[PDB]
């Protein structure tokens, strides 16, 4: 019962010698509703073939996000070249008021109380890369309680 979505695309088609060339790309996210989120890229000679190749890569493992219960307990750094980025939990009761530019990557797991819109860049790639590569850097309750105990 995994959930499977696009986010972004290119027009990617230029002049040459010689006439014009074109391509078909995709940036997609997948997840599993108990807490697991992931992401994958692709390309083809054709539209859905690129989406296919992209989602097939997105189906890889999916990071179990530290949720307790409907949303998550630390601002884990999504570190990139300035995105910064962080998200902010809301008090488990009001919705996913996140940036529609990157909301996908948390609605594929049904994370119901997290907000923050597109902080330092007007580009959905900038934040969607920044997040998954910094979500792997999360800590469990039992890990923050070893870090401040044993």
């Amino acid at each position: 019962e995994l959930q499977e979505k696009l986010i972004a695309v290119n027009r990617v088609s230029k002049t040459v010698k010689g006439g014009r060339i074109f391509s078909f790309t995709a940036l997609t996210v997948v997840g599993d509703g108990n807490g697991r989120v992931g992401f994958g890229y692709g390309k083809a000679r054709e539209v859905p073939a690129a989406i296919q190749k992209a989602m097939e890569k997105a189906r890889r493992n999916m990071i179990n996000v530290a949720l307790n219960n409907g949303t998550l307990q630390h601002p884990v750094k999504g570190v990139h070249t300035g995105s910064r980025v962080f998200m902010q939990p809301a008090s488990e009761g009001t919705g996913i008021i996140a940036g529609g530019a990157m909301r996908a990557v948390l609605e594929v797991a049904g994370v119901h109380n997290v907000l923050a819109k597109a902080y330092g860049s007007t580009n959905p790639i900038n934040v969607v890369r920044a997040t998954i590569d910094g979500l792997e850097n999360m800590n469990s309750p039992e890990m923050v309680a070893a870090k401040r105990g044993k």
């Binding site: 307990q73 630390h74 601002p75 750094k77 902010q88 939990p89 870090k147 105990g149 044993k150």
Partner: protein, 129 residues
């Protein structure tokens, strides 16, 4: 480091603790040894020792978990003359509730939580998280 007493105490626990060491050692100072104490007793470090008693050195067992610095999210916010004195209910309450900060006031160096409960404001040394 003398341009900002006692600031190097928060940089050195970031440096060594990123840099592969379970250990760091330095000369002691009028606020640092109380900070070392609270960092253990909350558990952000594994131990501290103090050594050469009549003119002592100050030594902390950094917590080299996954090879990454425990004090990576840290900020030392009060600076020279442009101090940060805050009232008993203006105090830090960070990370949506999970905390914390380390302060100093009319009973010593302590956590912001333990300050809020004693009902006192103070000198905001650092946001530990």
């Amino acid at each position: 480091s003398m341009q900002d007493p006692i600031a190097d105490m928060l940089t050195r626990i970031r440096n060594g603790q990123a840099a592969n060491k379970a250990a760091v050692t330095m000369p002691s100072s009028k606020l640092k040894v109380a900070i070392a104490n609270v960092l253990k007793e909350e558990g952000f470090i594994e131990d501290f020792k103090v050594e050469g008693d009549t003119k002592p050195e100050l030594e902390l067992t950094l917590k080299y978990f996954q090879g990454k610095a425990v004090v990576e999210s840290i900020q030392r916010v009060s600076r020279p003359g442009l101090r940060i004195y805050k009232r008993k209910d203006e105090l830090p309450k960070v990370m949506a509730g999970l905390g914390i900060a380390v302060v100093s006031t009319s009973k010593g160096v302590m956590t912001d939580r333990a300050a809020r409960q004693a009902g006192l404001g103070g000198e905001i040394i650092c946001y530990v998280a």
